[PDB]
């Protein structure tokens, strides 16, 4: 079988980047990046302090990555390529060229590698940088501007726990209507903020409408979402094929020497959806990527989720232990063998077995030495505020011969 | 070693060990050293207002 | 010894205990990035030479670097599936017998036959040979049926607690606490979590639900808090570990940012290729998404204290009764409403 | 605003009707809720009663 | 600071257009009775007195 | 796959070896579901040479 | 799998059917008796 070449430009996930070589990249200390953001100001009366426009100013600094890949040669061929012990030249001729083949064959899928990995590389750092829409949402909609008080900002707490208590699964539970998945689709695309506009060329559709990003999915959900949910835009796109490189030299160059500073289409098959008024990308890439490799894909992470049940209750109030019917669970017994206080707890397993955990199973927390581990406790008790009790209850006395 | 022409020239050459509670940094390398080769540097990408 | 007598027989001492047990699952997960999110650097590709078994080696290394020039944020993710959980739900006691470090009974024997005891009627134990100058490593078992064995950690707790607590998405160290709720100055995160001078935050007419594991030095906190370090020793992961001990936290930034520092994908905390739920190994990434880990409550799910009343007799969904006579039901209330299924 | 009363007890022995004969029932040979009422439970905000 | 003069001068100079806006809903919302009582008294009551 | 992985593995084939056993003469009223599962079953052979 | 799914069964004919008319019954255990529900593969299939 021959392999087939995954090019990073033809897919989807390059348009949430923008890609520029530079050949100094290993002698770099702390790139800087800078932003001069301004702000509005209304007017108005009454007892209100006026107000004074804002500028506000910040920073942000690169972070430094790198790609390896490795390519292995046996010793054989080692020893066919390297010219020593030629004898028989009609038959050593075939194990060279064979020898050849197999560096060059191996030396292709190697250079291939780097360019199927840099798509692994956005993804990470793409899964990385972003946020959940069940925290993001409410809060990019309730707090008009910020700097909060106590109160609305503990409603606002109150309402994120509701909100990723409600939202968790919102695919696989709410799966039987569409209207639902395409409303918060437009949401979770209409949430987030845009990007700077200085560019040059952009993926663009066959039209020409610019698209605006990209929504990376897996391939079950690509067809879930594509089946009733969203409508197809274009099956055809536009993308660059350069990279744009830069280098420093001139004044740029004794700069960096001396002082240690320095300052500065082709036709794709892929499909295109339309999410409220945004026209993005729907890319699913799992048999172009990670396809007969020996990585996991991303996208499929874990959650963890902590249960508590209380164990041995038993309600003190007279008051409610009350029965909703007469007769409801009845027994032989002159005596009803469910008054007794409880001593276990019933719950069901990953696959729906019923279990019980017994207070047989607290022997391996309360029958350990760690009960009468009293001594810390006395000690970080004596250093305390202590005013003089009376030692009624306390204090034991000697008799006197009466 | 920045790389750029010396101002002046410096007469007087001696011991400069023995004299070291001068000047601010002081730096001795017997032939040379893997620290005089390293230009790393800091380069700003660009401002956005 | 006594309370060993106690717990073979079948009596009731007077305590009750609260179990947590933390459990993973598998999600498809939904990205969506805006188009100049990152900016991308691409090196130069370097080639090392390097010595092989009878060859050489080429190893090829490029580096590369990324800014996100977005002003705010410009990708949002959310779960949106659920695939098979890796874990099991099992009912798995924690041993504390792997730990060492505190204060031994007087007699040996009495310890060699409380381990004894405790060794019975459980799956995770220390090995008989008590290796000496060793991890205590439990002793390795045949193949797995139904997933990861998850640890359930007991905490004592008074009888007479009121049952309401439990019913909803609760604190299992019996006082709410917590990162969350600051604005007058830096030193509150401890006068919240440990002051019982002032009041609960949250059920604003008491100071903590019980007494026994929510103080500065209670029974819970001498046990799982991780400054102390009792269980260091001790392989095995406890699911109640986040909830006691105090986190490291800067207020230079607001709430809500740091909140959504606190609410991306952190590293995971427990084993995935074990069967036991082991404590973290060092050097592996694996980065787990944690609800309820930045909220600092846990969440209840299907349980009752008879299986008499947790399954009604209709051939469908199950029972629904509250209490019956002093027993109990609660209700569902983990985000595991829809799914998996009984 | 929300208006609430606590320990308004019915005075008519009329008034004091129960809709079924087994509805809450207990094992104490004398029923804890002809006693007057002392109390009174509420939602909070949360849903917590 | 001829610049950062232009670039203060010009927001303070929108900010009256801005809050002329915001002066004229507060108002309007002053002059306005609720519809939940101005609907049934336009009705119900014909003429007056 | 690890240990792990398989055993949850083979939990998920038993549910789904007792799930979609006799799988036309039982939802025999959702045509919509049996060309949804017939896409799955054609698009799960590897192809040959 | 080295399995065997258990069929419709009951230990007293009085709870393996209900008085409506129609479906069978879903009474689990009444007094020490029991009816096992069926968890085999044949739910919709071999009518009764």
Redesign the interface.
């Given at each position: 079988n021959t392999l087939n070449f995954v090019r990073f430009l033809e897919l989807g996930l390059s348009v949430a980047c923008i890609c520029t070589k530079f050949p100094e990249l290993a002698?770099?200390?702390?790139?800087?990046?800078?932003?001069?953001?301004?702000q509005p100001m209304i007017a108005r009366d009454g007892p209100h302090p006026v107000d004074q426009p804002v500028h506000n100013y910040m920073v942000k600094r690169?972070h430094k990555r790198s790609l390896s890949a490795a390519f292995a040669i046996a010793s054989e061929a080692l020893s066919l390529l390297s010219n020593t012990y030629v004898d028989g030249t009609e038959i050593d001729s075939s194990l060279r060229i064979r020898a050849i083949q197999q560096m060059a064959r191996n030396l292709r899928t190697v250079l291939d590698s780097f360019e199927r990995g840099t798509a692994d590389q956005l993804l990470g750092v793409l899964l990385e940088k972003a946020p959940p829409l069940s925290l993001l949402s409410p809060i990019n909609k309730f707090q008009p501007e910020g700097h909060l008080n106590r109160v609305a900002r503990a409603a606002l707490l109150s309402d994120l726990k509701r909100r990723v208590c409600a939202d968790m699964f919102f695919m696989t539970r709410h799966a039987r209507e569409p209207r639902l998945i395409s409303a918060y689709l437009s949401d979770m695309v209409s949430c987030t903020q845009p990007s700077?506009m200085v560019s040059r060329i952009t993926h663009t559709n066959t039209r020409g409408r610019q698209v605006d990003g990209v929504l990376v999915t897996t391939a079950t959900l690509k067809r879930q979402l594509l089946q009733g949910i969203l409508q197809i835009d274009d099956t055809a796109a536009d993308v660059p094929v350069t990279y744009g490189e830069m280098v420093?030299q001139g004044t740029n160059l004794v700069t960096?020497?001396?002082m240690?500073?320095?300052?500065?289409n082709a036709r794709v098959p892929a499909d295109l959806v339309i999410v409220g008024d945004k026209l993005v990308f729907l890319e699913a890439l799992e048999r172009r990527v990670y396809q007969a490799t020996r990585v996991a894909y991303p996208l499929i992470g874990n959650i963890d989720i902590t249960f508590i049940m209380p164990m041995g209750v038993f309600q003190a109030n007279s008051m409610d232990r009350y029965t909703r019917h007469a007769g409801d669970f009845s027994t032989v017994s002159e005596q009803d063998p469910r008054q007794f206080p409880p001593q276990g707890i019933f719950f069901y397993n990953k696959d729906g077995i019923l279990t019980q955990l017994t207070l047989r199973d607290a022997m391996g927390t309360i029958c350990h030495s760690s009960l009468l581990d009293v001594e810390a406790t006395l000690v970080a008790l004596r250093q305390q505020h202590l005013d003089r009790q009376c030692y009624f209850g306390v204090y034991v006395a000697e008799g006197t011969e009466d | 070693p920045?790389?750029?022409i010396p101002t002046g020239n410096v007469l007087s050459t001696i011991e400069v060990c023995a004299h070291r509670c001068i000047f601010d940094f002081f730096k001795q390398i017997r032939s040379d050293d893997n620290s005089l080769y390293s230009?790393?540097?800091?380069?700003?990408?660009?401002?956005?207002? | 010894i006594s309370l060993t007598h106690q717990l073979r027989t079948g009596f009731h001492p007077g305590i009750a205990f609260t179990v947590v047990r933390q459990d993973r699952f598998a999600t498809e997960q939904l990205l969506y990035a805006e188009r100049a999110s990152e900016?991308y650097f691409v090196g130069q590709i370097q080639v090392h030479h390097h010595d092989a078994i009878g060859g050489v080696n080429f190893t090829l290394t490029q580096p590369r670097a990324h800014?996100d020039?977005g002003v705010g944020y410009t990708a949002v993710c959310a779960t949106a599936a659920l695939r098979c959980p890796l874990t099991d739900m099992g009912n798995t006691a924690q041993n504390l017998f792997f730990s060492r470090g505190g204060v031994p009974m007087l007699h040996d024997n009495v310890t060699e036959s409380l381990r004894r005891i405790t060794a019975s009627g459980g799956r995770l134990n220390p090995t008989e040979p008590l290796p000496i100058f060793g991890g205590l490593r439990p002793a390795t078992s045949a193949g797995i049926a139904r997933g990861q064995a998850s640890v359930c950690e007991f905490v004592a707790m008074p009888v007479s607690t009121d049952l309401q607590y439990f019913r909803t998405a609760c604190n299992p160290r019996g006082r709410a606490s917590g990162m969350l709720y600051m604005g007058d100055r830096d030193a509150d995160i401890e006068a919240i979590m440990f002051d019982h001078t002032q009041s609960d935050v949250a059920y604003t007419d008491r100071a903590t639900l019980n007494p026994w594991a929510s103080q500065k030095h209670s029974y819970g906190d001498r046990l799982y808090n991780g400054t102390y370090n009792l269980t260091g020793a001790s392989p095995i992961y406890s699911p109640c570990f986040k909830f006691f001990t105090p986190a490291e936290v800067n207020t230079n930034c607001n709430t809500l940012d740091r909140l959504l520092m606190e609410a991306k994908a952190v590293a995971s905390q427990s084993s995935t290729d074990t069967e036991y739920q082991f404590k973290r190994p060092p050097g592996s990434t694996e980065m787990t998404q944690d609800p309820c880990g930045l909220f600092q409550e846990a969440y209840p799910p299907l349980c009752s204290s008879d299986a008499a009343m947790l399954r009604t007799a209709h051939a469908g969904e199950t029972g629904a009764d509250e209490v019956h006579l002093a027993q109990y039901l609660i209700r569902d209330a983990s985000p595991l409403r829809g799914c998996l299924p009984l």
């Open positions: 002698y770099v200390r702390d790139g800087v990046i800078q932003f001069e953001v301004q690169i700077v420093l960096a020497l001396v240690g500073k320095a300052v500065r | 920045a790389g750029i230009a790393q540097f800091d380069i700003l990408l660009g401002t956005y207002c | 900016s800014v020039l």
